[PDB]
From a paper:
It can form homotetrameric channels or heterotetrameric channels with TRPC4 and/or TRPC1. The fourfold symmetric channel has two-layer architecture, composed of the intracellular cytosolic domain (ICD) layer and the transmembrane domain (TMD) layer.
By comparing the cryo-EM maps of hTRPC5 in complex with CMZ with both the apo state and HC-070-bound state, we found a nonprotein density within a pocket surrounded by S1-S4 and TRP re-entrant loop of VSLD in the CMZ-bound state. Several residues in hTRPC5 are close to CMZ molecule, including Y374 on S1, F414, G417 and E418 on S2, D439, M442, N443 and Y446 on S3, R492, S495 and L496 on S4, and P659 on TRP re-entrant loop. Among them, F414 forms a π-π stacking interaction with the chlorophenyl ring of CMZ. A putative cation density inside VSLD, surrounded by E418 and E421 on S2 and N436, D439 on S3, was observed in both CMZ and HC-070 maps. One lipid is located near the S5 and pore helix from one subunit and S6 from the adjacent subunit in the CMZ-bound hTRPC5.
Numbering used by the authors:
A (entry chain C), C (entry chain A): 17 to 118, 134 to 273, 286 to 386, 392 to 664, 706 to 734, 739 to 762
B (entry chain D): 511 to 663
D (entry chain B): 715 to 734, 739 to 762
E (entry chain B): 154 to 204
Write the structure that this text describes.
Amino acid sequence: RIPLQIVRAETELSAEEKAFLNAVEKGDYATVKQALQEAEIYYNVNINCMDPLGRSALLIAIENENLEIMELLLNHSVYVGDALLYAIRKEVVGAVELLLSYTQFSEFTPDITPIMLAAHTNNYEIIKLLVQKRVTIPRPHQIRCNCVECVSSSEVDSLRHSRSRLNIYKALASPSLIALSSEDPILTAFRLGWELKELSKVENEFKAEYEELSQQCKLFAKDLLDQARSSRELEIILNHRDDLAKLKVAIKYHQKEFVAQPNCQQLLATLWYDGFPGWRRKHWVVKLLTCMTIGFLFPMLSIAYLISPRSNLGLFIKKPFIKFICHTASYLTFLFMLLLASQDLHVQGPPPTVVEWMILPWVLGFIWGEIKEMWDGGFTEYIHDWWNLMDFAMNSLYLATISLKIVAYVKYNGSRPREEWEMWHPTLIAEALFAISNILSSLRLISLFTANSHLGPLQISLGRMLLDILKFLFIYCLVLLAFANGLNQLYFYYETRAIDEPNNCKGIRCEKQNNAFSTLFETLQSLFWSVFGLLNLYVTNVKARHEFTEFVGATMFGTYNVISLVVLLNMLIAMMNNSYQLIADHADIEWKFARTKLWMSYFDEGGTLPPPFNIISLIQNQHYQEVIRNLVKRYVAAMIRNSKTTEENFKELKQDISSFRYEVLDLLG
Amino acid sequence: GRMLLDILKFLFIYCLVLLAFANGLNQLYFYYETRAIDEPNNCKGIRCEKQNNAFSTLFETLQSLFWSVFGLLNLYVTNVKARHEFTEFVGATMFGTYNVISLVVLLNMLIAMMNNSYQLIADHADIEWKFARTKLWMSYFDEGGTLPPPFNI
Amino acid sequence: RIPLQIVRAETELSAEEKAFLNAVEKGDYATVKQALQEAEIYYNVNINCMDPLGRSALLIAIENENLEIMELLLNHSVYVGDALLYAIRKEVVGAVELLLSYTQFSEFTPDITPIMLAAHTNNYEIIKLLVQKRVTIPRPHQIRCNCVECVSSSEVDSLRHSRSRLNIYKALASPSLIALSSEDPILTAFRLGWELKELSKVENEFKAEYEELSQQCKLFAKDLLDQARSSRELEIILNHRDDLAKLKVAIKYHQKEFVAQPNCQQLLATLWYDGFPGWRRKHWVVKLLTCMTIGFLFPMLSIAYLISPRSNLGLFIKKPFIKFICHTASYLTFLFMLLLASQDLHVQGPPPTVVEWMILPWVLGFIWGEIKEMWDGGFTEYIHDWWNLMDFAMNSLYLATISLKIVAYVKYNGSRPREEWEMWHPTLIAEALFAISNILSSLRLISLFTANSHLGPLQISLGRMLLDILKFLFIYCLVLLAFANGLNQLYFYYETRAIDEPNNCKGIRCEKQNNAFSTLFETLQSLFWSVFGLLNLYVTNVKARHEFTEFVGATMFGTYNVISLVVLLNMLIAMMNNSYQLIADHADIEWKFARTKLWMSYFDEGGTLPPPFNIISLIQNQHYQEVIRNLVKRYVAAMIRNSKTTEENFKELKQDISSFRYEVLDLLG
Amino acid sequence: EVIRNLVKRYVAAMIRNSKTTEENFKELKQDISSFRYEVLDLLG
Amino acid sequence: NYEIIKLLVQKRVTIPRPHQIRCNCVECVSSSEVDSLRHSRSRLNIYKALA
Ligand SMILES: CC(C)CCC[C@@H](C)[C@H]1CC[C@H]2[C@@H]3CC=C4C[C@@H](OC(=O)CCC(=O)O)CC[C@]4(C)[C@H]3CC[C@]12C
Ligand SMILES: CC(C)CCC[C@@H](C)[C@H]1CC[C@H]2[C@@H]3CC=C4C[C@@H](OC(=O)CCC(=O)O)CC[C@]4(C)[C@H]3CC[C@]12C
Ligand SMILES: Clc1ccc(Cn2c(CN3CCCC3)nc3ccccc32)cc1
Ligand SMILES: Clc1ccc(Cn2c(CN3CCCC3)nc3ccccc32)cc1
Ligand SMILES: [Ca+2]
Ligand SMILES: [Ca+2]
Ligand SMILES: [Zn+2]
Ligand SMILES: [Zn+2]
Ligand SMILES: [Zn+2]
C-alpha cells in the first residue's frame, strides 16, 4: 500500500472560520455581518483567514462579484493587499471602483502593477479608470542596450528581468492602452509591432510571445483602418505627415495587413489607373488590345515626354499604369533584340553588328538607371531589394562583355578560324559572358508576375519555397562532397590520358564517358549529372581486373544514388508540401503587399523614361486628430460589441440567486 | 531522422519484391549465361559499355534490378542470342512488372508515407531539436575530453 | 426603389390574441387563466390562434417547458394535434406524460409517429414511456423487394416512400430502442448495421444517411461490449450461440470496431499464445530465438503430430502461434528450395533433379490444402478471399509446369542444343511458367505482414491505395491506347525487315532500337517503356527524308511523355497522398481486424500440418440474457452521464424566472 | 401554393435550427436583479 | 431575423434598387468619384439586405 498524507502541511481553519467562509461563499449577507460584528467583540474568528485554495474572504467576495459583501468586508477593514489585482483580472468594474475608493502567496508576480495588469486584460473600462489618475509604465531600454543597469539586472536575475520586460511590452502593446494615451495610435502600433518583431528575433526564448504581441499590434492598426467610413477619412489617414506618406511608413514597417486593406487597395487602384476611369469594368479582349496598343506606342510616348512634357502625349506617360506598360514594352523589345542577336564568325574581335549597336543603348540605359536609383533611393534601401543583386550581376556581365569585345577588337586584326583559337581567347569569354547575361535578362521577367492576379501569389509561393530549397541544398551538398571525396580517393589511381581515349576526349561529356571519378572536380560533376541519370554505369569500370575495386566503387555510386534520389529528393518533396500548405493561407496578403510596392515604384517622377530614353501642417494635424478620434470611438464600440457577441458566469448566477434567496428568507421569516 | 524510420519500414517490402523478381528473372535467364571471352570487349556484367548477362546469376540479377530503379539498366539486356522470342517476351514482361511496381507503386507510396510522417512530426520539431541541442551542450560541460584530437593523446 | 410587401399573406392576430400569446410567452399564469375564463364567456379570443411563427399557445407552453400553463391550456380543451410530437422532439418528460394522459402546417412529415419520433430523438426515458404501451413500428420490406405494394408506392410517390423507409430505419437503428425491445441487442445491432450498409450500397441517394446509421449501430455494439467488467462476462458474450461463435458472427458482418475491442483483442491474444504464458513480457532477442528454434524444429513437430498426437510434442503443434510458426517455416523452406533450384541444359525434357523432386511434395501439398479448404469452408467464403486468386494462379501455373515437363520428357529423347530449339518448345514454356510461379510464390509472403505490429497497418495502407492505383490505371490506359493508335497509324508505312537491321534484331529490345512504332503491339510496348525512359529518341526517325513525318511523330511522342509523366503521374501522387491521409486514421482498426482473421484461421483443427506433411443451451441463453441485462443497464447509465456531461436552455431559464416573478408579484400585491 | 408550403416549412426549420453568448448571461443577471429590486421594494 | 423583417415589411418600406454591375450613368460615376468608399459600402449593404 502507498500511504497518502500531507507532505507540505499548512494551517487548517477552525470550525467557526470554515463556517464564516462558507457563509461568504454562499452570499448570505446577514450571517457574514453577524460574524464580523461578533468577531469585533469576541475575537473568535480571524477575518483574514485563507481557505484550502488560498483565497481569503475578500477574494471570495471578489470572485463571486458580490459587491455588497465586498463593501461590508471593506468597511470592517480586512486585509486588502493585491486584492485590486484580482479585481482587475476578474474584469469587474464595480470591484475595481470599490477598491480604488478604499510575503504572502500571490498569483501575480511582484513586478505586476494595477495599470500593467489592466493593460494585460485589455479591458477598456478599467484601463480608462486607471489612466484617469496619474499612472505611469516604466520605459523599456534599447533592444541591444548595454548600460550598467541592464547588465546588472540580467546577471543578478535573468528570469526576473526577462519576465518584467515581457510584462511591460504586454502592457504597452494593449490595443485599448494604445487607443488612449497615444498621440498617433497608428504610428505607435507600427513602431511597437516593429520593435516587438525585433525583440522576437533577438530573444531566442519567448519568441512566440513577442511574435503574437507584434501580430496583435498589426491587427490593431488594420482594424483602426477598417473603421474608416468615407474616402475623405481614408485619404486623410494615408496622407498624414508625422503623398501617401503614412502608407509609405506602413510599407517601411512591413505592415502587410494594413497595406492589403480593401479600401487602401481600392484607393491605390484608382491612383494606378489614372488615365482609364473605367478599367475595372472591361472585357478581357478590350484590356488586352489597349495594353498592346500602349506597348506598341511606347517610343512615341517617350519621345513626346522628351520633347514637350505638357501635352496630351507628353504627360500621358507619367500615369502609373501607362508608365508600367511602356517600361515593360521597352524591356520586351530589348529581349526581342537579344533573341535576334543570334540569327562571318572567323574574325577575331569583329566590329559590333547592327543588332549589337541597337542593344548597346539599352545596356547603357540599364546601367544609368541602376546608378540613378542607387543615388536617389540610398544604399540600405537599394541593398535590401534582392532583385537588385541580379541587376548588378547582369550589368557587371554586360560591362565585362563590352570590355572583352573592345580588347578583342584592338588586340586582334587577322581572321583565324575558331578551331585553332586559344581556349581563353577574349572573343570566346566575351560570348560566354554575353550568353549568361542573356539568360539572366530573360529570367528577370519573373518580377513582373507581381502585376498579375493569377501569377502574383504563385510567385510569392515559389519564392517562399525557395527558402526550403536552400535549406535542403546544404545537407545535399554535404552528402555530395562526402561521396565525391570517397569516389575520388578510390578511383584516382586509374586516371588515363586523353590520348588513350578512343576519340581523344577525356571526361564525362564524351560519347563514351571516361575518367568520371579521376579528379575531385570531375567526380563532383559526375555525381551531379548522376542525379539526372546522364552518367552511365560503365564509368565505374577500370581497365585493370580489379573486380573488388570496381564493386566497391559501384557500391559507393549506388549508395549515393539511393541517398540523393530515394531519400533526399522525397524529403525535399515533403518539405515543399508542408511549406506550401503553410504559406497558402497568407498568399493573398503577401501578393497584395508586393503588388502595392510595385505600384508605388511607378508613382515617382524619377525614372519615368524607360531605357534607352533615360540617357538622352497644423490644420493637417488637426484633421488627422479628428479622424483618429472618430476611428478610436468606432473601434472601441466595435470591439466591445464583438467581445459581448465560462464556469465563472454560472458561479456568479448561482451567487446572485443565493443572495436573493437569503435576502427574501430574512425579510419574510 | 524521424522520416528515416518510415524509409526503413518501406525498405522491407521493397526488398521482398526485389528478391521475388530477382529469383524469377534468374530462374528464367540462367540458361543463357555466356563466358566473358564471348563478350565483345572481354567484359561480363552490367558495368560494361554494352551490358550483358544482366540476369545470369542471382547476385548479378539483384544488381541489375537495383540499377533499373535509377534507369541505368538498358532494355536490350532482356534479349538472348537464341531466337526464343517467347522467353525474351516473358523476361521483358517480368522486368516491366518489376519497374511498374518499384517505381509507379512503391515509390509513390513511399512519398505519401513521408508526407504523412513529416506533417505529423512538424508540430514537435522544436521541442525535439531543443532536447537534442541540450544533450549536445551538456556533452561539452564535462572536464573530460577537453582537448580535441590529436591533442588528446 | 424596391417595394417590399407580403406576397404570401396570412391571417393577422387581433390585439387581444397578441396580448394573450405574449402573456403565454412570458409565463404569467394569472393573466392566461383570466384570458381563458373570459374567452369562455365573451368568445373574444381564439385560444387556438397561431403566431407569426406558426406556434399556438400550447406549442409556446411546450417550447418554454411551462408545465403549469401546459396543464391549464389542456384543462380548457385547446387543440392538441401533433403537440405530442413537439413535446417528444423537445425531449421534455413532463410534457410527454401530460399529453399521454390527456390539414394545418406541421414541422413533422405525415408518416412520423410518436414512437418513431422518440426513437429518432434516442431519448431513453420517452422511448421507454412509449414502449410501456402497445406501440408498433411497421416492418420495412426487403432491400430488393419486388412485391406489388412496393412498386405501387414507388411509382405513385417515390419521395414519400423513400422518406418513410428512411424514417423507419432511423427509428429501428436507435440505440435506446435496441437496448429495449430486443432479445439480443448485439446480434440485432450487427444485422441492422449490415442491412443499413446494403441499403447505402443500393440507394445511390441517401447514401450518407444510411452509412451514418450503420456506423451508429456498429458503435452501439462496440459500446455494449465496452461495458463488460470481467473476463467471465466477455467469454459469455463472445461464446454465445444464437467456440467464439458471436466473435465469428461479428467477423462475418464486418464489425471491425467490435472485433478490435481491447478486451476482445486481449482474450484473442491469450488464446493465440497458448503455449507461452509470458510472451507479453519478453525481450526481442528471446522472442526471436524462440521463433527461430520453433521454425527449425517444425519437421519434428509435424512428424510428432503424425505419429502420436497425444504427447508433449504431438499436440504442441495444435497451438495457434506454434502452428503459424511451423507453417511459415515450411513456406520459407519451400522458397529456399525454389532459390536453390536455379544453381546439363541441352537435354530436351530432362528428368527432374533432386531439388525438383524435393519441390514436388510441397506443390502437391499446396494443391491438396487448397482443395481441402475449398471443400471444408465452402464456395462463397473461398471466392471472397482475394489472396485465394493468387493461390489459384500459382497452383495452375505449377500444374501447367508439371504437365509440360512430362510432355517434354515423353516427346523428346535427344540432346539438341538450346540455340536451335523451337520458339514454342515445351521446355522453354515450362521454364517460363515455373519462373512466373516462383515470382508469385515469393510475392505471396505479403499476406504474412498482417501478423506483425509494424508491418500490418502499412500493408493495410498499401492495399487501400491499390484501389486509387486501379482507378488511375483506367485513364492512363485510355491515353496510352490513343497515342499508340496515332503513332502506329503514322509509322506503320516505314516498317523494315529484320534482315535490314544491323544485327538481324528487330524491335526495341535490340542494342540499337528500331521499328518502335511499326505495329500496334510494338507501339504499345514502346510507349510503355518510354514511361521509364528506356526508349531512345532516335526511334522517331525514319530512313526516308520525311522531316515533317518525323517531326509529327516526335511531337506525338513528346505529348505522350508530357501527359503520362508530368500530368498523370503527379495526379496519381496527389491521389495517393489524399487517400493515405484519409486511411491513416483507421489503419489500426483495419489491421487488428485483419490480424484477428489471421489468428482465427489458425484456431481450427483442419490444416494443422503444413505442406508437405498434409498429404502423408437453455442455461447458456439465461447466462447471456443476464450478462446482456447488466451491459444494457451500464450502457444506458454511461450514455446518460456522457450526454449530461443551447439557446433553448437560456429561454427556459428566463421562462422560469419570469413565472416566479409573476407569482411573487401576484401573491404580494 | 407549393412555394407557400415550402416557405412555411423552411422558416420553421431554420428557426428550429437557430434555437437548437455573454449577452445571454447579462440578460439573466438583469432579470434576476430586477426581480430582486421589485421584491425588496414590495416587502420593505 | 424573420420576426423583425416581417414586422418592418408590414409597413410600407422600400430598399433602393442597385444599378447595373457595369452601369455608366452620371449618378454612378459622380458617386464613385465623390466618395468611392461610401458608394461601395452602400452597394454592399443593399446587396446584403436583398440576399
Ligand atoms: C510564356 C513565354 C511565351 C514567355 C513570355 C514572356 C513575356 C511575353 C511574358 C512573361 C511575363 C508576362 C507579363 C506578366 C505580368 C504582366 C501583368 C499584366 O497585368 C495584369 O495581369 C493585370 C492588369 C494590370 O497589370 O494592372 C500585364 C502584362 C504583363 C506585364 C505580362 C506581359 C507579358 C509577359 C512579359
Ligand atoms: C526482406 C527480405 C530479406 C525478404 C525476407 C523474407 C522473409 C524472410 C520475411 C518476409 C516477411 C517476414 C515475416 C513477416 C511477418 C512475421 C510476423 C512475426 O510476428 C511478429 O512480428 C509479432 C509476433 C507474432 O507473430 O505474434 C513473425 C515473423 C514473420 C512471419 C516474418 C518472418 C520473416 C519473413 C517471412
Ligand atoms: Cl541587364 C539589366 C540591368 C538592370 C535591370 C533592371 N531594370 C529593369 C528590369 N525591369 C523591366 C521589366 C522587368 C524588370 N528595368 C530598368 C530600368 C532602368 C534601370 C534598371 C532596370 C534589368 C536588366
Ligand atoms: Cl504455389 C502456392 C499455392 C497456395 C498457397 C497458399 N498456401 C499457403 C501460403 N501461406 C504460407 C505463408 C504465406 C501464406 N500455405 C498453404 C498451406 C496449404 C495450402 C495452401 C497454402 C501458396 C503457394
Ligand atoms: Ca533595379
Ligand atoms: Ca489459401
Ligand atoms: Zn539599459
Ligand atoms: Zn414489398
Ligand atoms: Zn447608374
